[PDB]
Design an enzyme around this catalytic site. Structure first.
Site, short mmCIF file in Angstrom:
data_model
loop_
_atom_site.label_atom_id
_atom_site.label_comp_id
_atom_site.label_asym_id
_atom_site.label_seq_id
_atom_site.Cartn_x
_atom_site.Cartn_y
_atom_site.Cartn_z
N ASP C 349 3.85 -18.97 9.76
CA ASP C 349 4.86 -17.93 9.62
C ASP C 349 4.52 -17.20 8.35
OD1 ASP C 349 7.66 -16.42 10.34
OD2 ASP C 349 7.98 -17.42 8.29
N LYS C 460 17.54 9.96 -2.77
CA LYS C 460 17.83 8.76 -3.56
C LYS C 460 17.11 8.74 -4.90
CE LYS C 460 17.88 3.69 -2.88
NZ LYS C 460 17.20 3.27 -4.13
N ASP C 690 9.60 -21.47 8.38
CA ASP C 690 10.76 -21.71 7.51
C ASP C 690 12.09 -21.28 8.11
OD1 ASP C 690 9.94 -18.93 7.13
OD2 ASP C 690 11.42 -18.88 5.51
#
Ligand SMILES: *[C@@H]1O[C@H](CO)[C@@H](O[C@@H]2O[C@H](CO)[C@@H](O)[C@H](O)[C@H]2NC(C)=O)[C@H](O)[C@H]1NC(C)=O
Ligand SMILES: *[C@@H]1O[C@H](CO)[C@@H](O[C@@H]2O[C@H](CO)[C@@H](O)[C@H](O)[C@H]2NC(C)=O)[C@H](O)[C@H]1NC(C)=O
Ligand SMILES: CC(C)CCC[C@@H](C)[C@H]1CC[C@H]2[C@@H]3CC=C4C[C@@H](O)CC[C@]4(C)[C@H]3CC[C@]12C
Ligand SMILES: CC(C)CCC[C@@H](C)[C@H]1CC[C@H]2[C@@H]3CC=C4C[C@@H](O)CC[C@]4(C)[C@H]3CC[C@]12C
Ligand SMILES: CC(C)CCC[C@@H](C)[C@H]1CC[C@H]2[C@@H]3CC=C4C[C@@H](O)CC[C@]4(C)[C@H]3CC[C@]12C
Ligand SMILES: *[C@@H]1O[C@H](CO)[C@@H](O)[C@H](O)[C@H]1NC(C)=O
Ligand SMILES: [Mg+2]
Ligand SMILES: [Mg+2]
Ligand code: NA
EC number: 7.2.2.13
Lengths: 291, 32, 996
Positions: C349, C460, C690
């Site tokens: 992963d 932003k 995980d």
């Protein structure tokens, strides 16, 4: 996955032909060498021992005391009437005493007449082969009175009041030493304490000792034991056709239809005993003359 | 008499050997 | 009907989130600003179940105990004990005064399984108990709006269809349908694998209910901001709830180590029944009746079962699992310790497993130069040059102009693993200034803030003006940050080593290619700038309220860029290199964007540098991708959108022709399908994850590796191995120990299997040659369960004969644990020399006492008879029953000693499979003690007062200990020259027939 038997690319039972030959050849060479090696070492082992004496003799320290009717459980159960009931006993007695006949001991070159009286030990030199084949003292069936007879091919023995001879375990170089004249309560026995190994039978408890009425012993000249003139033993190689001493015991007053236990204990200083081996020194028998 | 073997001395030797070898092995695994 | 229930869960979830505000409230029947009445809340509370996943299926302790008494190996010892009592049933009822030997063995075989069960159960239970001390289940109360009033209640007290409000920092209770948000970014890391904080927008964005923003998810934490939402799913019906229920209803499979145990039993019983039957028929052909022949069959088959091997194997695996726990690599399974060694394809992963799952400052642009900051977790990398003035000017822009501060207890904790309040980007900036630029505590208060402008929804930008504390210039310092494309429009000056320069296109385009460089690397880049306000126009007393243009937006002084991304762990790149070096194919399986996953794969080792994908070749030739040949592309990026429309043959084709594969945007279910596709190749697969998306991937895999802390609890319970320290290099240690124990097992097994030949051959020729028994039963138990226990265990402490991390992973279809070579050696050659060595001692003892070997033929007839007390020897001596039985037992005791003597050489030769003993060396202290203890115990079993009384083992005459000496030396020399020819001639003969 279990049909790897064959294929068109050569496999049998799992591998090819050339591979089966290579492996089989290797295993034959390997095992052949292993066989030759085991044989060589075992040959060295054979050369570390002599032909006239066993290297270790301490495991036979206390000699045994066997009998002629080698019963399945040291029990003598038969019928005083039915002859086939006691056939297994008599057959063994005749086969045992077949080598003690006057015709069997006829050669004077290997037999020596010891005597009618038990005398001192007869040592025929050392145990080496410097001397020729030693002589074996004779032992005629007449010594065991009332349990020998002059019967035909079939020794008509005792139906009622049977006979049971005892034998001292033949041991190489064994010199029997009867107990000293200071006999520690040895059950009435004759005064021939110096030249005969005593053997006295008895019951086992207050019951067996009472059931067994009278016992009659027979031996060389009438002594209940083994004469010292027949010892020591010089092996089968130097003394073939050797005749160890015998001594018969007859139980006259028995209580028919009752199994009673008898313990024939051999006494002497060189005779040991054992709580695990009921035959070392002593001897047991379970007699039952059921009518 | 040749019918006797000093089994007690050999037995005693076998036990002392079995004791010394075991304590030595214990010293082997305790390299400190 | 559970077959249909699992299938409706393997499907990707669906939703009705794409509805208007009026329609959702009509379907759920819920007010949008007041929620629902408390009575209506308690009605759905007592209707379907409280908002909590159903607890895992409890596993009682008596269940797993009876489990350890069963198995595959213990099953063999069980059927053996049954044959012992069956043979005892035949021997007791048919003959007079039966012997208690066979029954003594039946009770012993049963006790072997019970003791092994208690020990192995204590080890697996000890593994589960320390895991019970890791459930830090902290109840979290949610903020639910009901009846127009806000109430904080337990998480389990929440129902379907009611307004729920979350605060920046609050964990999303159940799966919500966002109705009103405000700069709310949720952390979908533990669930879908998205790394950066994905904002949650009330409007429907993507068809996939996962990529969309109008949905809050179970087990996800709100990073910043706040938002409202209506509960759609609750409990097990949630997203991660259905994923967890799927992980609980999946099959673990058959481990490779257990497959080798089963394959071992097939051969042990194959040759055992072969000998038992061949000798059964041979026995009936000779003279023995059916009564005795059946006992011969059972005795021969049972004696061919390695009794002491179950304990040595269980202890061997236990000894390796011990080292696994020493380095904080716990294994809930005792045999999963070997599974890493047989691994050939690792499915890893990305977010949380390969990476740290935490935003950290990566690269910086200053003086038209890219500087890489230390992104390691333990700060063990190269530090950038921190002496110029451009760095101080940029660091003040970031350390001052940021809405990030430390908390209360964040003092003794490290600068990186400590909690920081605010956005993920601002958190990375604060952790970089507090680590490389001193501290931000006194540095923030050094510049007194006057007027600030927070992050805006459009264009932003974040700016703020501060007072200047330098003892030279009293001009106010204005700092601003934002996206590079937004700050480039509001600047004209440029900072370089301290002085300013104009916006010349030569260095401006130099900033643009740096923007595309740090961006294409999958990082998030921000632009920082500052400007000195004129103190003659804006004095120290003038207040620049936040209304009109009080600060010049343009003509600012840009200092540089700052990129950031979740970096991989410290020992992750080297570990990947070690796994590819051993030959394990590494394939990344994640649900993140391909733009970041491709860069991470290139940075960890999954995608090598220079290897091009199907897309990179097309971009290099300026041709469409449909032109290139996928064979010309060594690596390839597999998108999750396209994986949904695939078959099994296509996935097989992806895995065969491509060595470096990266599966991006794959749903948890797709992770399971990828694992199944890799298992279709017949290769061993280990999955390391995980998040909860990795639960169905770690459970179905041959072994699942979960993180002890950074991983969720679901994937931690479904995995077979836990990394308490989260150090990914533990995987490298696991594969090393997994292959090492496998070879030590081969050695430990051939050792116990060699002793079978001299343990059975006496009873065989006893029937063949009709000779007295050379080896008793009690004496055999003293070998299998006595002396050989310590050498077989000490044989596990062996090291590597070469480099194990250099050889390739084993082939499950070719390299078996116990092949026909090990049997050709133990049962064929070594055990053969040991059997002959025993028979030699046997004949030596008998011939020296008066029973010459030639006289021993056909003697067992009157020998085992208890009443023939005048058995004649070779010298004519008459032997009573107990005298010759005394010699037979004192003939079994030296046979046992003979076995130990030949086992000296057998332990030294099995110690090394290829190298010479002089090469490896007797440095194994446990093996040295294995010999000392074996010898002292053997002498003790013969010379202890009362051995002939309890075990019928009489003392030995000191001349017997040397009868087996030449045979042991022969075994040693033959096997040493064998390994020597294996060394000089590694071609085929000496290697494909004897090397096991
Ligand atoms: C051997 O057996 C004979 C019987 O055949 C015994 O002879 C008897 O002996 C008793 C005295 O004990 C006499 O009263 C009988 O008249 C004898 N009968 C016969 C037919 O001779 C003889 O006693 C036995 N020998 C021994 C030593 O007991
Ligand atoms: C032989 O044994 C018998 C017993 O079987 C003895 O005779 C018994 O003597 C008791 C008195 O003590 C009487 O009550 C029995 O009636 C007698 N039985 C018989 C059959 O006579 C006998 O004395 C023993 N004889 C010898 C020589 O020992
Ligand atoms: C191959 C070599 C180096 C192994 C070293 C161990 C050998 C030399 C040791 C191990 C066991 C030993 C025996 C241990 C027990 C007995 C009985 C005792 O009362 C006399 C010593 C004697 C007879 C020993 C002879 C030497 C012996 C065989
Ligand atoms: C009591 C006596 C007669 C039994 C004799 C059994 C002997 C002859 C048998 C027992 C085990 C056998 C071996 C078993 C293992 C191997 C390796 C294999 O791939 C080929 C067969 C081969 C090479 C066998 C050769 C013959 C062998 C040694
Ligand atoms: C090629 C060479 C090294 C092999 C020579 C074989 C040697 C090692 C073998 C052959 C015969 C063996 C001996 C055979 C006879 C005896 C007497 C016995 O009660 C104890 C064993 C003992 C003491 C053996 C010791 C080892 C021995 C001498
Ligand atoms: C033993 O002592 C008795 C008298 O107590 C005596 O008659 C006999 O001759 C002695 N025998 C020997 C061998 O001394
Ligand atoms: Mg993850
Ligand atoms: Mg065994
Ligand atoms: Na599993």
């Amino acid at each position: 996955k279990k049909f790897i038997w064959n294929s068109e690319k050569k496999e049998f039972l799992g591998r090819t032909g050339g591979s089966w030959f290579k492996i089989l050849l290797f295993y034959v060479i390997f095992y052949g060498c292993l066989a030759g090696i085991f044989i060589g070492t075992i040959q060295v082992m054979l050369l570390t021992i002599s032909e006239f004496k066993p290297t270790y003799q301490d495991r036979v320290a206390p000699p045994g005391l066997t009998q002629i009717p080698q019963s399945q459980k040291t029990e003598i159960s038969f019928r005083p009437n039915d002859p086939q009931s006691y056939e297994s006993y008599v057959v063994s007695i005749v086969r045992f005493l077949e080598k003690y006949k006057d015709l069997a001991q006829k050669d004077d070159m290997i037999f020596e007449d010891c005597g009618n009286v038990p005398s001192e030990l007869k040592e025929r030199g050392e145990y080496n082969n410097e001397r020729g084949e030693r002589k074996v003292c004779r032992f005629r069936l007449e010594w065991l009175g009332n349990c020998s007879g002059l019967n035909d091919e079939t020794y008509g023995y005792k139906d009622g009041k049977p006979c049971v001879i005892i034998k001292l375990n033949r041991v190489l170089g064994f010199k029997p030493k009867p107990p000293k004249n200071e006999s520690l309560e040895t059950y009435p026995v004759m005064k021939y304490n110096p030249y005969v190994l005593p053997v006295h039978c008895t019951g086992k408890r207050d019951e067996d000792k009472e059931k067994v009425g009278t016992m009659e012993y027979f031996g060389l000249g009438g002594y209940p034991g083994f004469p010292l003139q027949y010892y020591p033993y010089y092996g089968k190689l130097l003394q073939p056709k050797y005749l160890q001493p015998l001594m018969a015991v007859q139980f006259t007053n028995l209580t028919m239809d009752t199994e009673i236990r008898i313990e024939c204990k051999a006494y002497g200083e060189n005779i040991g005993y054992s709580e695990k081996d009921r035959f070392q020194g002593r001897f047991d028998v379970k007699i039952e003359v059921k009518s | 008499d040749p019918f006797y073997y000093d089994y007690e001395t050999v037995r005693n030797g076998g036990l002392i050997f079995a004791a010394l070898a075991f304590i030595v092995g214990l010293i082997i695994i305790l390299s400190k | 009907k559970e077959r249909d229930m699992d299938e409706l869960k393997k499907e990707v979830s669906m939703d009705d989130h794409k509805l208007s505000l009026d329609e959702l409230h009509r379907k759920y029947g819920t007010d949008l600003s007041r929620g629902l009445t408390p009575a209506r809340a308690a009605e759905i509370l007592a209707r379907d179940g409280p908002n909590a996943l159903t607890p895992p299926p409890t596993t009682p302790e008596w269940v797993k105990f009876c489990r350890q008494l069963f198995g595959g190996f213990s099953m063999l010892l069980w059927i053996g004990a049954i044959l012992c009592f069956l043979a005892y049933g035949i021997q007791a009822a048919t003959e007079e005064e039966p012997q208690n030997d066979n029954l003594y063995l039946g009770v012993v075989l049963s006790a072997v399984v019970i003791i092994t069960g208690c020990f192995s159960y204590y080890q697996e239970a000890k593994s589960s108990k320390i895991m019970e001390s890791f459930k830090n289940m902290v109840p979290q109360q949610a903020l639910v709006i009901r009846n127009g009033e806000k109430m904080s209640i337990n998480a389990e007290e929440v129902v379907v269809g009611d307004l729920v409000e979350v605060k920046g920092g609050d964990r999303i209770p159940a799966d919500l349908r966002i109705i009103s948000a405000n700069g709310c970014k949720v952390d979908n890391s533990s669930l879908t694998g998205e790394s950066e904080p994905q904002t949650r927008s009330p409007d429907f964005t993507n068809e996939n209910p996962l990529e969309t923003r109008n949905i809050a998810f179970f087990s996800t934490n709100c990073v910043e901001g706040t938002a409202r939402g209506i509960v759609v799913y609750t409990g097990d019906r949630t997203v991660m709830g259905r994923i967890a229920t799927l992980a609980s209803g999946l099959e673990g499979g058959q481990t490779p180590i257990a497959a080798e145990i089963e394959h071992f039993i097939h051969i042990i019983t194959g040759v055992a029944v072969f000998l038992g039957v061949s000798f059964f028929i041979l026995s009936l052909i000779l003279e023995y009746t059916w009564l005795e022949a059946v006992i011969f069959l059972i005795g021969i088959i049972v004696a061919n079962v390695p009794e002491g091997l179950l304990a040595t194997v269980t202890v061997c695996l236990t000894l390796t699992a011990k080292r696994m726990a020493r380095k904080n690599c716990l294994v809930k399974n005792l045999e999963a310790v070997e599974t890493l060694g047989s691994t050939s394809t690792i499915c890893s992963d990305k977010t949380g497993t390969l990476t740290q799952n935490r935003m950290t400052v990566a690269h910086m642009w200053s003086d038209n130069q890219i500087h890489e900051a230390d992104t390691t977790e333990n700060q063990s990398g190269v530090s950038f040059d921190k002496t110029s003035a451009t760095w101080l000017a940029l660091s003040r822009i970031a350390g001052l102009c940021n809405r990030a501060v430390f908390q209360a207890n964040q003092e003794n904790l490290p600068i990186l693993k400590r909690a920081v309040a605010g956005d993920a980007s601002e958190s990375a900036l604060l952790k970089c200034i507090e680590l490389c630029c001193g501290s931000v505590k006194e540095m923030r208060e050094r510049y007194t803030k006057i007027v600030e402008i927070p992050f805006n929804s459009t264009n932003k930008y974040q700016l703020s003006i501060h007072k200047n504390p330098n003892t030279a210039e009293p001009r106010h310092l204005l700092v601003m940050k934002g996206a590079p494309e937004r700050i480039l429009d509001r600047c004209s000056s440029i900072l370089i080593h301290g002085k300013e320069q104009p916006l010349d296109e030569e260095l401006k385009d130099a900033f643009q290619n740096a923007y595309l460089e740090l961006g294409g690397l999958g990082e998030r880049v921000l632009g920082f700038c500052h400007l000195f306000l004129p103190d003659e126009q804006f004095p120290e007393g003038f207040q620049f309220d936040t209304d009109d243009v009080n600060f010049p937006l343009d003509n600012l002084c840009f200092v540089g860029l700052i990129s950031m991304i979740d970096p991989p762990r410290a020992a992750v790149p080297d570990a990947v290199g070690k796994c590819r070096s051993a030959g394990i194919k590494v394939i990344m399986v994640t649900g993140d964007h391909p733009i970041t996953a491709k860069a991470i794969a290139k940075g960890v080792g999954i995608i090598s540098e220079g290897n091009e994908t199907v897309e990179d070749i097309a971009a290099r030739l300026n041709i469409p991708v449909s032109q290139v040949n996928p064979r010309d592309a060594k690596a390839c990026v597999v998108h999750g959108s396209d994986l949904k429309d695939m078959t099994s043959e296509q996935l097989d084709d992806i895995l065969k022709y491509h060595t470096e594969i990266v599966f991006a945007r794959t749903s948890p279910q797709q992770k399971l399908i990828i694992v199944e596709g890799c298992q279709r190749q017949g290769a061993i697969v280990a999955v390391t994850g995980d998040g909860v998306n990795d639960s169905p991937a770690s459970k179905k895999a041959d072994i699942g590796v979960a993180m002890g802390i950074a991983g969720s609890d679901v994937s931690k319970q479904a995995a077979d191995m836990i990394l308490l320290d989260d150090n990914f290099a533990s995987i490298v240690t696991g594969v090393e120990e997994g292959r090492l124990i496998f070879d030590n097992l081969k050695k430990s097994i051939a050792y116990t299997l060699t002793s079978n030949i001299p343990e059975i051959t006496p009873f065989l020729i006893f029937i063949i040659a009709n000779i007295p028994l050379p080896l008793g039963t009690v004496t055999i138990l003293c070998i299998d369960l006595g002396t050989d226990m310590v050498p077989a265990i000490s044989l596990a402490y062996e090291q590597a004969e070469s480099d194990i991390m250099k050889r390739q992973p084993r082939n499950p279809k070719t390299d078996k644990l116990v092949n026909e070579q090990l049997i050709s050696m133990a049962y064929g050659q070594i055990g053969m020399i040991q059997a002959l060595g025993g028979f030699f001692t046997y004949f030596v003892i008998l011939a020296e006492n008066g029973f010459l070997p030639i006289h021993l033929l056909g003697l067992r007839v009157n020998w085992d008879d208890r009443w023939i007390n005048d058995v004649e020897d070779s010298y004519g001596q008459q032997w009573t029953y107990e005298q010759r039985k005394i010699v037979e037992f004192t003939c079994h005791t030296p046979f046992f000693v003979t076995i130990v003597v030949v086992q000296w050489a057998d332990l030294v030769i099995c110690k090394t499979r290829r190298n010479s003993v002089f090469q490896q060396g007797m440095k194994n202290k446990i093996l040295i003690f294995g010999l000392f203890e074996e010898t002292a115990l053997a002498a003790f079993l013969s010379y202890c007062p009362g051995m002939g009384v309890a075990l019928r083992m009489y003392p030995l005459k000191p001349t017997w200990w040397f009868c087996a000496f030449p045979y042991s030396l022969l075994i040693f020399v033959y096997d040493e020259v064998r390994k020597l020819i294996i060394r000089r001639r590694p071609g085929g003969w000496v290697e494909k027939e004897t090397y096991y």
